Amino acid sequence: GNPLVYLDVDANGKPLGRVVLELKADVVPKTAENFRALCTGEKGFGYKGSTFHRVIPSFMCQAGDFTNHNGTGGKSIYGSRFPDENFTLKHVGPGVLSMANAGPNTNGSQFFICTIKTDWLDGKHVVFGHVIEGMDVVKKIESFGSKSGRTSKKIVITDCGQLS
């Protein structure tokens, strides 16, 4: 069935725990496969050692810029950017996993985990999975954000990979 992947997250060098994500490869195979491979590192690059660089309480936690660490970078397993696959899955509530972008058809590697229903992003961001385990970890990350998105602790994905 659908891949399960994990992110182990530190804040200021202290482990917060593990976020487990189910990737909806049955709905968005291309988007799911990109994220899966970026978690395993099997292409020679990916999320390990990168950060949650933008976190806004009562909104979302954003990560995946493993090249510039600031929201401008990232790349996919296909090339720098790739198309919006579909908008079938919606931003239904907390725990939704969705692609960050720079407008239409600019998916790379940046992603966010929602902490509320972000319905206004429907039809603009490709949803591709959700949190299976570790919403407590997500809430910790969230609490280290600010209105500006600047984080008050250094939030690092120390390890990541595929569980099944």
UniProtKB/Swiss-Prot annotation:
Acetylated at Lys-124; deacetylated at Lys-124 by SIRT3. It is an enzyme of class 5 (isomerase). The modification N6-acetyllysine is found at K24, K124. Inhibited by cyclosporin A (CsA). Is displaced by CsA from the mPTP leading to a lower open probability of the mPTP. The modification N6-succinyllysine is found at K24, K43, I132, K147. Transmembrane segments: none annotated. Its main location: mitochondrion. GO terms for molecular function: cyclosporin A binding; peptidyl-prolyl cis-trans isomerase activity. GO terms for biological process: apoptotic mitochondrial changes; cellular response to arsenic-containing substance; cellular response to calcium ion; cellular response to hydrogen peroxide; mitochondrial depolarization; mitochondrial outer membrane permeabilization involved in programmed cell death; necroptotic process; negative regulation of apoptotic process. Residues 6-162 form the PPIase cyclophilin-type domain. One of its GO terms (cellular component) is mitochondrion. The keyword Transit peptide applies. It catalyses: [protein]-peptidylproline (omega=180) = [protein]-peptidylproline (omega=0). Its EC number is 5.2.1.8. It is found in: Mitochondrion matrix. Keywords: Acetylation, Apoptosis, Isomerase, Mitochondrion, Necrosis, Rotamase, S-nitrosylation, Transit peptide. Belongs to the cyclophilin-type PPIase family. Associates with the mitochondrial membrane ATP synthase F(1)F(0) ATP synthase; the association is increased by inorganic phosphate (Pi) and decreased by cyclosporin A (CsA). Interacts with ATP5F1B; ATP5PD and ATP5PO. Interacts with SLC25A3; the interaction is impaired by CsA. Interacts with BCL2; the interaction is impaired by CsA. Interacts with TP53; the association implicates preferentially tetrameric TP53, is induced by oxidative stress and is impaired by CsA. Interacts with C1QBP. Interacts with MCUR1. PPIase that catalyzes the cis-trans isomerization of proline imidic peptide bonds in oligopeptides and may therefore assist protein folding. Involved in regulation of the mitochondrial permeability transition pore (mPTP). It is proposed that its association with the mPTP is masking a binding site for inhibiting inorganic phosphate (Pi) and promotes the open probability of the mPTP leading to apoptosis or necrosis; the requirement of the PPIase activity for this function is debated. In cooperation with mitochondrial p53/TP53 is involved in activating oxidative stress-induced necrosis. This is Peptidyl-prolyl cis-trans isomerase F, mitochondrial. It comes from Homo sapiens (Human). The gene is PPIF. The chain holds residues 44 to 207 of 207 of the full protein.
